[PDB]
Design a protein around this nucleic acid. Structure first.
Lengths: 161, 116, 166, 121, 164
RNA sequence: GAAUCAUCGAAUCUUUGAACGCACUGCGCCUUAAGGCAUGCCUGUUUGAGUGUCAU
RNA sequence: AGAGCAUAGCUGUUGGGACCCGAAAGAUGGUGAGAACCAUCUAGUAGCUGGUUC
RNA sequence: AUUGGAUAUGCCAUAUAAAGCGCUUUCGAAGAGUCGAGUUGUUUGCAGCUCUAAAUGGGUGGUAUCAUCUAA
RNA sequence: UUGACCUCAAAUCAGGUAGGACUACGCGCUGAACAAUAAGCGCAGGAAAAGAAAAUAACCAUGAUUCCCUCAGUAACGGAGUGAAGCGGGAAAAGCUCAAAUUUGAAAUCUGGCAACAUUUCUUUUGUUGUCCGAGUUGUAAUUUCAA
């Protein structure tokens, strides 16, 4: 009806048709590979999370859930410790096993000293002993960078390993 | 001026697809963040427990989660709210601790330079 | 810092030093054009606290508007039209006399690479900020249209919402 | 007619008088046809018009490619060599400066990135 | 109009002789040029790259926020204020702040000379906080001259409304 | 390689019009038929002037 | 020793252009040259006129 | 054929660096012709005009001191 | 005489940008009759605007914004009429950046030219490295934003 739409109707040129209309279609999973492998492309996201043994929401649900079958004291809260929780399904066990095995592999958190760091701490140790770090930091000539006792202690600890 | 609701079923479906599109992006983690439990601010509703906005800094400190890492693991922070009673502190610290008991945090890769 | 002294001195708006300077500078500003470029802000404390940085891409323009709508809002829109390639950032009162009120506007060039590479002013480059002074999105524009938080500060009521099942 | 693929395999100044000869041929044939011609006459008008169009296409493409090569890795190039997507697209922030962050934001994301996690049921 | 005493004090500047002696000491303490700093840093870089303790640098102090901070901390020994700062409010409080802190101060002529010392186009104010042991006597002599030629002199017109 | 065909990333796209050398097709200018020659503004470059302030 | 709540239909009634139609307002913005003409607010109206279907 | 986020694995990594969480015989800056007061309009807001601030101050509430907030 | 700085200039100098159109839905300045309406004017985007409390409340307190339901055709104003909001239930959720404190043991910052090296939705797009100049101490980085 609009003159623009009448203009393109009267033209002999084809329309810029695009076919993107498919409802009932749910987004495919990218990101986690374990989830994608075990995902059910037909089931909803709640049905998939429950089957995989995950929580789709850490809070309440704001409606009625689907029922398919006829089913048959401050001290002891801030100080108690809960020993994690069981993995209900196999999918969660794969996620847990993968997490611990990657954390063990990427666990080297000890920094070795460099050439400058080694010489810096060596000059301080060979003059002010080994157990006295406060006197090491209070030196002005050898400790030119003015590192405090904690940093010199860390330089010692990293030198050992 | 009349506001019709012929798109009410369409909006229901559009929001469902947003939930699924979000879950497609973040595969194993919940589509919502954990909300605290608070009390409505009036004599009519103060006996009810509802969901809050985020956890106070004193709640996070007691549970052992620093405010800088709380957001990274899906724990909202409310700098505005405060714990005026020891009951609200205990109700939401336990909520955080139960949340951390059920949490699998996948490790991240870190850059370790060869030298010191 | 010397901006604590400038901020405190600007409160004594008609002391001996401030009244003499306002009288002297008003005479000079009336000699120049209505809208003229300022080599540097006359209030380096006030411009600094309103977002201005002494770097390329930041432009200061002075303007006088007759006394007797908001005067600051009128200064912002006229200067923004004058240099239409720039984005109006903020504005501030610098002087006034019996006839005129003088304002300086801070404008930002959204095409300069020192502006487009600064993440703190990168936001102004986006086209949603084209002529903020014309839509009331500056500080005085927001204040002029009652935008604020509290009880101090229609279409959805004049409608009749008719649900499907009603 | 002429083949476009082997037309590009010729020298530039060769295409010059080939266009010249084709243009006089079209003009001469038009002079012949206005005094009386058959239905085939307008058939070779159509072919020679497209042949001239094919000829001029090769000259312009070859010249354009030469200009692109001459201005490769130059800070400023003529507007006809520049991109033409949309006026707004040209004015937009480039992805490099779109992704610029302060050192405050770099440290935040270096030490506290959004973790990947899961909630057991 | 009638110039207020706070603005009228900037019309009386340090005389020719004492200003000449002031900039003679200052020119011994100019900050390292961008070029000279680069050569010194790459020299240390070559030492670091091949194989590898200094002293605290001595220079004049510039910048308005920096100098006002030094005056408030009583770290400054001599403050020289440009007499032609275009918005005068940037330095109109400086003589009084130097009086409150008991810092010797003077108002030297024009800002181009001050900027030239620090390798800039313009310096509204310069301050001297530390000198080498051999320049202690030269700085002390200038402080006396500044006091005798700027503080002992005037001190009565700076309370009077100038101009008109 | 047909197509009054489809796709479409390369080329071309008369005079106008925000319309831009001045009038509105004439009338022009400069440089080498071609290249050009609107206005405001921003960053920089270069050439000048000033009884501006200072140093020699 | 509670009788209500919800939905549907019917009827009445009050608003919306409100059974249809019939007099020019007035205002806003333009065109042409005081007056004229054009387009929207505007379904601004007729205590009434005429009509209102097996 | 284009590109998303990840994963795995090499090569580099300017770390003499940069962070979170402990502790304090040490400190802790906070936006003015603006708030506000008086008077005229539009609609408490906004604006003009005359005047013009403060630092545990200032705003807004419950008290009819307390609570809450931290503007330009 | 020369130089530094400032100011005023000029240039068919180099590199950029603005206008106009569409406006269903944004946001402004306005504005009749009869509605904070029509019309007029200005300015945008795929959304806009708003937005991390100078917010509520008087409770066992809540906690940026927006939208829906409810509150409620209620309070209030003024009998008629106009007519909200706090709470409550949902949708979605994300937080932050500066000014103001000396880097002062070192303007640590940035644009541009030139020269190489890459890179491309792309010979059309983006950068990186080096050098020189300029910006900048009348303040560019790092650090801090009261939740500290």
């Amino acid at each position: 009806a609009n003159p623009r739409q009448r203009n393109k109707q009267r033209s002999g040129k084809p329309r810029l048709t695009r076919r993107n209309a498919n409802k009932k279609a749910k987004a495919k999973i990218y990101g986690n590979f374990v989830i994608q492998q075990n995902w059910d492309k037909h089931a909803t996201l709640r049905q998939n999370y429950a089957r995989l043994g995950l929580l789709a929401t850490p809070n309440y649900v704001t409606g009625g859930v689907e029922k398919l079958y006829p089913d048959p004291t401050l001290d002891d809260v801030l100080d108690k410790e809960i020993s994690i929780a069981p993995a209900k399904t196999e999918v969660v066990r794969q996620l847990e096993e993968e997490a611990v095995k990657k954390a063990a592999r990427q666990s080297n958190k000890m920094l070795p000293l460099s050439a400058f760091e080694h010489a810096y701490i060596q000059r301080l140790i060979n003059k002010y002993g080994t157990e006295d770090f406060e006197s090491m930091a209070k030196d002005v000539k050898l400790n030119s960078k003015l590192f405090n006792g904690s940093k010199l202690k860390n330089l010692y600890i990293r030198m050992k390993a | 001026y009349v506001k019709t609701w012929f798109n009410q079923p369409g909006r229901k479906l559009r929001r469902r697809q947003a939930r699924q599109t979000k879950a497609a992006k973040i595969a194993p983690r919940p589509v919502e963040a954990i909300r605290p439990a608070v009390k409505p601010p009036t004599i009519r509703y103060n006996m009810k427990v509802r969901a809050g906005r985020g956890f106070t800094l004193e709640e996070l400190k007691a549970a052992g989660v620093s405010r800088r890492v709380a957001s990274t693991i899906g724990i909202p922070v409310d700098h505005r709210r405060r714990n005026r009673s020891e009951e609200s502190l205990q109700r939401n610290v336990e909520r955080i601790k139960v949340y951390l008991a059920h949490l699998i945090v996948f490790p991240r890769k870190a850059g370790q330079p060869k030298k010191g | 810092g010397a901006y604590k002294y400038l901020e405190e001195l600007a409160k004594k708006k008609q002391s001996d030093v401030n009244l003499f300077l306002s009288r002297v500078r008003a005479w000079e500003y009336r000699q120049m054009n209505v809208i003229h470029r300022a080599s540097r802000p006359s209030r380096p404390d006030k411009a600094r606290r309103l977002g201005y940085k002494a770097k390329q891409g930041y432009v200061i323009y002075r303007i006088r508007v007759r006394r007797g709508r908001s005067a600051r809002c009128t200064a912002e829109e006229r200067v923004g039209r004058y240099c239409s390639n720039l984005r109006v950032l903020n504005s501030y009162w610098v002087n006034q006399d019996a006839t005129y009120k003088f304002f300086e506007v801070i404008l930002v060039d959204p095409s300069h690479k020192a502006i487009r590479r600064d993440p703190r002013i990168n936001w102004i480059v986006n086209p949603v900020h084209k002529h903020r002074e014309s839509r009331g999105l500056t500080s005085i524009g927001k204040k002029s249209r009652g935008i604020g938080k509290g009880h101090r500060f229609w279409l959805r009521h004049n409608t009749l919402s008719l649900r499907r099942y009603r | 007619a002429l083949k476009t693929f082997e037309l590009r395999k010729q020298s530039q100044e060769n295409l010059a008088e080939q266009l010249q000869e084709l243009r006089q041929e079209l003009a001469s044939l038009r002079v012949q046809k206005i005094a009386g011609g058959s239905g085939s006459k307008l058939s070779k008008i159509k072919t020679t018009r497209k042949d001239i169009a094919r000829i001029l296409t090769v000259i312009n493409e070859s010249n354009r490619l030469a200009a692109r090569e001459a201005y490769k890795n130059k800070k400023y190039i003529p507007l006809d060599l520049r991109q033409k997507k949309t006026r707004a697209i040209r004015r937009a922030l480039t992805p490099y400066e779109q992704s610029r962050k302060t050192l405050k934001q770099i440290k935040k994301e270096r030490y506290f990135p959004l973790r990947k996690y899961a909630l057991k049921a | 109009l009638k110039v207020p005493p706070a603005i009228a004090q900037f019309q009386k500047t340090l005389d020719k002789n004492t200003a000449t002696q002031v900039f003679k000491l200052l020119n011994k303490y100019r900050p390292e040029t961008a070029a000279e700093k680069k050569q010194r840093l790459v020299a240390e870089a070559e030492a670091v790259a091949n194989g590898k303790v200094s002293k605290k640098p001595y220079n004049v102090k510039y910048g308005l926020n920096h100098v006002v901070a030094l005056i408030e901390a009583k770290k400054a020994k001599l403050v020289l204020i440009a007499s032609d700062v275009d918005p005068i409010e940037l330095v109109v409080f400086l003589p009084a702040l130097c009086k409150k802190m008991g810092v010797p101060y003077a108002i030297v002529k024009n800002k181009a000379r001050l900027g030239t010392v620090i390798h800039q186009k313009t310096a509204a104010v310069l301050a001297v906080t530390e000198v080498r042991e051999e320049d202690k006597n030269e700085l002390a002599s200038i402080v006396s001259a500044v006091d005798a030629n700027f503080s002992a002199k005037y001190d009565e017109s700076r309370r009077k409304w100038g101009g008109g």
